[PDB]
Amino acid sequence: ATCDDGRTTANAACCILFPILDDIQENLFDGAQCGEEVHESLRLTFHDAIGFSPTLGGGGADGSIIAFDTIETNFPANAGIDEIVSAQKPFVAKHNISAGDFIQFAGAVGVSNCPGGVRIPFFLGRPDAVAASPDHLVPEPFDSVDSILARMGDAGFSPVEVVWLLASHSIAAADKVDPSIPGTPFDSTPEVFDSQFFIETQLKGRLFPGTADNKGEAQSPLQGEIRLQSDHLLARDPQTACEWQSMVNNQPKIQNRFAATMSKMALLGQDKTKLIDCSDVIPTPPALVGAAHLPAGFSLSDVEQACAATPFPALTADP
Ligand code: HEM
Ligand SMILES: C[As](C)(=O)[O-]
Ligand SMILES: [Ca+2]
Ligand SMILES: [Ca+2]
Ligand SMILES: [Mn+2]
Ligand SMILES: [Zn+2]
Ligand SMILES: [Zn+2]
Ligand SMILES: [Zn+2]
Ligand SMILES: [Zn+2]
Ligand SMILES: [Zn+2]
Ligand SMILES: [Zn+2]
Ligand SMILES: [Zn+2]
Ligand SMILES: [Zn+2]
């Protein structure tokens, strides 16, 4: 199909997304860059979608975190999310798509700006949200592995899928874990969707980048990087450590599994067969530039290897 401005897409219903794409690329993503608002928009896709429990309710990827922002943004696990919700709200008001569609569209567009990134499958047509998520549905960085895997499993994700989703932490920072050092990233390349997060979380912790007693924080290996306790444990626990290590210097697996599992997450509470595939509106991501490495001065002895079956791969260090 050909849209009014000459751009093409498989289904004509998708044409409405093109002015939305251009607006968010400039005005939410700072000119199609992989910066703060991409990272916050990607976090928003998960905090919207994981509000989904067969027992307790919540409609999953339904825009509830925007439609019922007064309730959801005050949940403790949603600390700091009000900023991206307030930034996205005027776009939803101006354009003619539902909040649930907008949150997943913005997350997919954002990720596509990141070198190494992927085009997350995107489907159009979610109805407006009809309930707020229950509290206590979003995993917290001081939750146990058992807790996190039980919560994610309740929403439909296996332990390997949790690891795959956490490739998101390769383009991510924290503002509320240690409020003395807001904006501190989880890996050394927060504007590159790469395996550095899976490498750097496996290094021996050395320091606290800000203060020393924050709930849900573990020691980091690097000044200028922050480590969550949940990531420390997921990299080391016998249920997940082998999958975690399998991501290291495995860019094709990171890409393939993150895209597939993000699509599953973006469809929680929805029926793909009732929606329209508009995946081809999402931009082509740039390539990695771009090689997996240990930080300068580090060696393989600094890796806390946690997979009994497979030795950690031999990486080189930056000079
Ligand atoms: C599995 C359990 C998870 C836990 C415990 C967790 C925890 C956290 C925490 C504590 C922060 C920092 C919030 C702040 O202080 O500002 C964060 C940020 C973030 N999370 Fe995760 N997360 C999890 C899973 C995921 C998933 C599945 C995604 C996929 C979309 C995701 C995407 C992000 C992104 C992109 C950020 C960066 C936000 C920014 O830069 O402001 N998280 N997460
Ligand atoms: C059950 As919970 C996700 O608030 O630790
Ligand atoms: Ca929701
Ligand atoms: Ca990265
Ligand atoms: Mn942030
Ligand atoms: Zn910006
Ligand atoms: Zn519009
Ligand atoms: Zn509407
Ligand atoms: Zn709770
Ligand atoms: Zn709790
Ligand atoms: Zn908890
Ligand atoms: Zn365990
Ligand atoms: Zn480096």
Curated annotation (Swiss-Prot):
GO annotation, cellular component aspect: extracellular region
Superkingdom: Eukaryota
Protein localization: Secreted
Annotated keywords: Calcium, Disulfide bond, Glycoprotein, Heme, Hydrogen peroxide, Iron, Lignin degradation, Manganese, Metal-binding, Organic radical, Oxidoreductase, Peroxidase, Secreted, Signal, Zymogen
Cofactor remark from the record: Binds 1 heme b (iron(II)-protoporphyrin IX) group per subunit.
Residues annotated for Ca(2+) 1 binding in this entry: 48, 60, 62, 64
Cofactor field: heme b; Ca(2+)
Chain segments annotated as transmembrane: none
A Pfam family the protein falls into: peroxidase
UniProt enzyme class: oxidoreductase
Function: A versatile ligninolytic peroxidase that combines the substrate specificity characteristics of the two other ligninolytic peroxidases, manganese peroxidase and lignin peroxidase.
Name of the protein this chain belongs to: Versatile peroxidase VPL2
